[PDB]
Amino acid sequence: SSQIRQNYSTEVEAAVNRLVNLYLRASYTYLSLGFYFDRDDVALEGVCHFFRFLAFFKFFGAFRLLKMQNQRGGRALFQDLQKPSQDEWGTTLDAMKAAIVLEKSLNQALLDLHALGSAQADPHLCDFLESHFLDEEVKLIKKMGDHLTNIQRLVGSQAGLGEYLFERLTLKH
Amino acid sequence: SSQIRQNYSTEVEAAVNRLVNLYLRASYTYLSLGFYFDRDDVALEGVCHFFRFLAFFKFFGAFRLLKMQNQRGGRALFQDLQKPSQDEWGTTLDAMKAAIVLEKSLNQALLDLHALGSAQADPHLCDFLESHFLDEEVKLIKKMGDHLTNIQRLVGSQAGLGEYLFERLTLKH
Amino acid sequence: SSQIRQNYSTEVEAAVNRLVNLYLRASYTYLSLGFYFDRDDVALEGVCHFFRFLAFFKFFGAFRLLKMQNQRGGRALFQDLQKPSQDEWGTTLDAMKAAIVLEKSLNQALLDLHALGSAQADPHLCDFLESHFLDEEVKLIKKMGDHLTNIQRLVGSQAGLGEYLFERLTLKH
Amino acid sequence: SSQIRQNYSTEVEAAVNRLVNLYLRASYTYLSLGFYFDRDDVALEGVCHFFRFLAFFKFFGAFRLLKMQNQRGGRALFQDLQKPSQDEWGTTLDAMKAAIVLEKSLNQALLDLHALGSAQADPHLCDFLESHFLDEEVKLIKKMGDHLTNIQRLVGSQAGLGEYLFERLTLKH
Amino acid sequence: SSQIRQNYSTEVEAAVNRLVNLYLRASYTYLSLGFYFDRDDVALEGVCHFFRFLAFFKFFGAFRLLKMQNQRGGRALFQDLQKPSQDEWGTTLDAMKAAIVLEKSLNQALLDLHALGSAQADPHLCDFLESHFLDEEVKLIKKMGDHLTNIQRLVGSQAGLGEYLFERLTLKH
Amino acid sequence: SSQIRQNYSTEVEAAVNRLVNLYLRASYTYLSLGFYFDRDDVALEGVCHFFRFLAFFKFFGAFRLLKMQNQRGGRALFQDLQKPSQDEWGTTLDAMKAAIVLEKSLNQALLDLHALGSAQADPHLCDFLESHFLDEEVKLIKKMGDHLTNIQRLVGSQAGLGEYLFERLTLKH
Ligand SMILES: CCN(CC)c1ccc2nc3c4ccccc4c(=O)cc-3oc2c1
Ligand SMILES: CCN(CC)c1ccc2nc3c4ccccc4c(=O)cc-3oc2c1
Ligand SMILES: CCN(CC)c1ccc2nc3c4ccccc4c(=O)cc-3oc2c1
Ligand SMILES: [Cl-]
Ligand SMILES: [Cl-]
Ligand SMILES: [Cl-]
Ligand SMILES: [Cl-]
Ligand SMILES: [Cl-]
Ligand SMILES: [Cl-]
């Protein structure tokens, strides 16, 4: 089979491939989010930049997973990448809500894979997730929650004003 | 006639002179826009600076056209320059709407001249427009559209507040 | 419809979206190629790096296309991204042959889009492709052809030796 | 009326607008002079540069006038800008003669406006002209007179030689 | 046939080879011009340097054409290079007239090749000429026209004096 | 005749012109060699660079000869330049064999011209060849012989491998 593979279950190997798919889909979703906010009829540069950065971060999560798959002697297998769930993403609030839903799903997939690794007595896998993914994910979700709260505080009765101010004064542009 | 002129039609020569007129008129329109926003009873420095910069950019478009006319062996001919269409330019929104109308007209004149050059098998003319004008124009129109959207989002029911905030937080001052 | 869109046909808009799909698929194909050559049982670092670089270049081609779609006032629409055509890519020769087939297909799609733009009298589109895509593509295809020739010269009767030497002495590692 | 305007007559306000028109026309005349000397069949780079510089200086005179109009609480009003008096400008001598005629007319307009300001007991206006215009104008006219004398000395019986030498050895290129 | 060639007609391939011949002949003509002006009985260093520089520029035009021929998968084919049309080149005026005739012929060959590329729907070829040749050629022809005018102005009745002065005060030495 | 010419025979003058022709032909031969090795179906960059460098060196030999012809008061006369002897140059071995044949012919022409100068008691000519040509030529021929030997050692029974290795490990790329 493999000359390096050791303590690396078929179940973990397949789950890692699934997780790569999920990260690449997330990157794709963020690519779509970023270009939507770049539209001339949306035009929220800070929001564009926030999601563009996340497209790159999620790609690099996939890349790290694939590197690890090879380091362990598993075989990368790629599947079709589903398009994002929407073509238009509504307001900054709508978009940030969709982003936290996405991130919570990615987090649950990380937790599930960690639990599989623990069941399989695969400490390298468990350490890998802990060291490179689980805290990054908690930090990201906390940032999105912070943003959601600030966006919600700004809606009030002048929604356009609040959306502009959030983009200008919170997000980097 | 001319010792350098080669593959440069009378039709293109005249159209280039017309286009110089249009760019100089545009520069004049932007000069008027800039000084209107500098009025003590208007007083939107960022808006002033935005249109002042465009007066200079449109002059330099004219200048480049005239340089090219001479490089090709055509003869610059100047006409009367019509004053701008308004003496007072209303709100930032009104002004940005008038600017995008102006830019779309300049863009259509560029496209028309490109089509004439293509019909006349004048690739130097076509390349010149492509390289120095067509993308600059698309970029400018996209920026104005972005601005229009942000200004429109800010009107809401507190128009003065939105006009101040746009000037302060989007435009450079 | 759109406040900026001008001289930008629905046919071009759709074709640009199709081309984005093709570039993202190409990026995905190169991602798979790169990780295959990173396998412990393949282990050709220079080949890995060559295809990894191309995954990034093709993503950035897609990104530029999407930026232009927005600059013109079109609407990015994303579709499902087909997985790559193979899970395992054979020898360096096999892989470089598959890469040139891919690149020739991307080149033909560029040429087709250029021809559509010309038919539609869309010089901005034509210039955009000429300036950012057509020469990059010719340069890439020429490099791949050079590589193919060198790989073919090295097969002889000691194929493993030739594959090692090409990776070590031509490709960057 | 105006919240800042003080000691600023309607007569001065209108005269300042007229003077802006005259400076912009002068800039236009110099633009035409500059491009005439850039013709391949004229080809006197130093002369081109001399008049090009004056086109920019006269624009900036207009700009300063418009800035002052706003500082005083007057209202900029723009009129049609007459094309220059000639399409072709003859020899360097002809051109320098036309330039000094133009400058003397601008100087007389400055003097007239100064006299109006003095009659109206408008010392800010009087100081403004004295500080930014009257000496600049005297210096420019003296330079042109110097040039005229040197050009006239060079005509003799070898006019082409003299025109070349003046361009090469006096004017900056 | 070729593993890289795509959208590159036999007609364009042959025309590119012809154009290489024309550029190399032009380089040869300029080599002869340069050494004629270096003769002890001609001795016009600035003129020598002007034509020497053009010999190098025309060689590099040929070189770029040959590089492109290979990038496209065509085959460079070289023919005999005709000697220049004269052994002695007369006055600076005669020489500059012969140079502009040469350049106009090269320009017409560029335009002809561009038209062939357009007819063949070869945008890479069209872009290549536009980007590297057509404007360089217009700029060169305009410079030569400028020079011709200055040389003609200097003939007058003291031709030797004018030829010396042009060499000393216009051309770089 | 000439105001500087002294001790410079018609026989030497003509022979120098012949030698210029031979150097320019050699430059042309090397230009063809260089672009052949740049072909996508040849693709030996080090070989390309070796012959390209020689095209430039042989041009500069011609240039020095023409400079000397003028320094002595002779008259440069150019003839038609024959195309190179082949359109395709075979293997690196074939090409290096053709290069040493060419160089030996150029060397014999140098020796013949030296012998003519000696017979004519023209020490300046003799010194010129000795100082700028004869040792450069011996050094070049020795380098080519070294290369030939190394290429021959590498043929063995795996000719493609040897051709690759020579290009990669001996020639500069
Ligand atoms: C599989 C197809 N997909 C998902 C849409 C890819 C493929 C490659 C990508 N490569 C990058 C990338 C590469 C280098 C530097 C920065 C970035 C980046 O910010 C985002 C990326 O996103 C990608 C998505
Ligand atoms: C009103 C139409 N007209 C008169 C023909 C203008 C408008 C704008 C101009 N802007 C410049 C300018 C702007 C920035 C930097 C340098 C220059 C310059 O050297 C000359 C100018 O000349 C102008 C004439
Ligand atoms: C007479 C037509 N032929 C022979 C094919 C020429 C003419 C001019 C050339 N000029 C150069 C040259 C010029 C400047 C810097 C580098 C180079 C060079 O590497 C090779 C050259 O090769 C030439 C051949
Ligand atoms: Cl499938
Ligand atoms: Cl009129
Ligand atoms: Cl779907
Ligand atoms: Cl009117
Ligand atoms: Cl022949
Ligand atoms: Cl002949």
Numbering used by the authors:
A (entry chain A), B (entry chain A), C (entry chain A), D (entry chain A), E (entry chain A), F (entry chain A): 1 to 173
Give the original sentences from the paper that presented this experimental model.
As a scaffold for aromatic cluster design, we chose ferritin as a protein cage platform with a 12 nm outer diameter and an 8 nm inner cavity, composed of 24 subunits. To prove this concept through protein engineering, we focused on a two‐fold symmetric inter‐subunit interface of a recombinant horse spleen apo‐L ferritin (Fr) as a target region for mutagenesis. Herein, we present the construction of an aromatic cluster with an artificial molecular binding pocket at the two‐fold symmetric interface of ferritin and explore its ligand‐binding characteristics. We developed a system that uses ligand binding as a driving force to induce and propagate changes in the orientation of multiple aromatic side chains.
The resulting mutants were named Fr‐F2 (Fr‐E56F/R59F), Fr‐F4 (Fr‐R52F/E56F/R59F/E63F), and Fr‐F6 (Fr‐E53F/E56F/E57F/R59F/E60F/E63F), where i in Fr‐Fi represents the number of newly introduced Phe residues per ferritin monomer (upper). The largest number was obtained for NR•Fr‐F6, showing 10.4 molecules of NR are encapsulated per protein cage. This amount is in good agreement with the number of the pockets at the two‐fold symmetric interface in the ferritin cage, suggesting that 12 pockets of Fr‐F6 are occupied by approximately one molecule of NR. Analysis of the 2Fo‐Fc maps revealed electron densities corresponding to Nile Red (NR) at the two‐fold symmetric interfaces of NR•Fr‐F1, NR•Fr‐F2, NR•Fr‐F4, and NR•Fr‐F6, observed as overlapping densities due to the interface symmetry. NR was positioned between two F59 residues, forming π–π stacking interactions in an F59–NR–F59' configuration. Anion‐π interactions between NR and E60 in NR•Fr‐F1 and NR•Fr‐F2, and CH‐π interactions between NR and F60 in NR•Fr‐F6, were identified, indicating NR's stabilization in the F59–F59' pocket via multiple non‐covalent interactions. Upon comparing the protein structures before and after Nile Red (NR) encapsulation, orientational changes of Phe side chains were observed in NR•Fr‐F6 due to NR binding. In NR•Fr‐F6, compared to Fr‐F6 without NR, the occupancy of the alternate conformation of F60 and F56 changed from 0.3 to 0.7 and 0.3 to 0.5, respectively. The dihedral angles χ1 (defined by the N–Cα–Cβ–Cγ torsion) of the F56 and F60 side chains, which directly interact with NR, changed by 219° and 102°, respectively. Since the residue F57 and F53 have tendency to form double conformation having weak density of the alternate confer, this might be an indication that the rotational movements of F56 and F60 upon NR binding propagate to F57 and F53.
